[PDB]
């Protein structure tokens, strides 16, 4: 049948118009980078569970990432399958960590849930060995899992800082993971929707992301 639909997706339909007209009156967000962040290899040892910044930190012997997710979630909204991928060079993911830690634990992040690679793990030649070593999971911020457009705003701008970031810290760019899309300006992020597009797509799945509406409010 058609693509998996979505009350999120279908919201953003309805005011699309207002939505991205709105965003553009908005100023600059102000995200205070986190001190005393975790490395990336202390981030490894976090084993059953550990703590920085209100996030939860797990890695262990299951799969090949270590993750981080807010104990008390900002964003209300049942997950949507929005998510940005982060592809750096191969071996500099964990200077790329050091360069990020400040925005991915800040507590003006909008993101709730995001996972690294663990390099010592994963297969080398890996989509998310190559390129895409973080996830960044979005999620709407309303009780009703409709995206407000003061959070569209901060996700863009956040995603706006990490390039920005990346690109003054010296990181390289990765490969893109052939699933996603991403704008001429973005060096270093991409996206898809997990809900209408798959990880081992491609071009073929290439317009439809394109057209997706939050893409176009992050990208257009």
Request: aromatic share 10%; charged share 25%.
């Amino acid at each position: 049948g058609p693509p998996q639909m979505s009350a999120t997706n279908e919201d953003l339909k309805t005011n699309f118009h207002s939505l991205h007209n709105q965003m553009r009156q908005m100023p600059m967000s102000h995200f205070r980078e986190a001190l005393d962040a975790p490395d990336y290899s202390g981030m490894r040892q976090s084993g059953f569970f550990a703590m920085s910044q209100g996030f939860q930190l797990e890695s262990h012997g299951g799969d090949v990432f270590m993750h981080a997710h807010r104990e008390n979630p900002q964003c209300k909204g049942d997950f949507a399958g929005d998510k940005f991928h982060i592809s750096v060079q191969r071996e500099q993911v964990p200077q790329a960590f050091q360069a990020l830690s400040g925005l991915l634990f800040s507590v003006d992040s909008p993101i709730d849930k995001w996972k690294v690679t663990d390099m010592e793990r994963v297969d080398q030649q890996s989509r998310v060995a190559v390129g895409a070593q973080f996830t960044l999971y979005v999620k709407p911020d309303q009780e009703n899992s409709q995206y407000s457009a003061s959070s569209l705003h901060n996700t863009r701008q956040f995603i706006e800082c990490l390039e920005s970031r990346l690109s003054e810290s010296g990181l390289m760019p990765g490969q893109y993971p052939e699933s996603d899309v991403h704008p001429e300006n973005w060096k270093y992020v991409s996206y898809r929707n997990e809900l209408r597009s798959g990880r081992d797509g491609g071009e073929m799945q290439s317009q439809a992301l394109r057209e997706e509406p939050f893409y176009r409010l992050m990208a257009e």
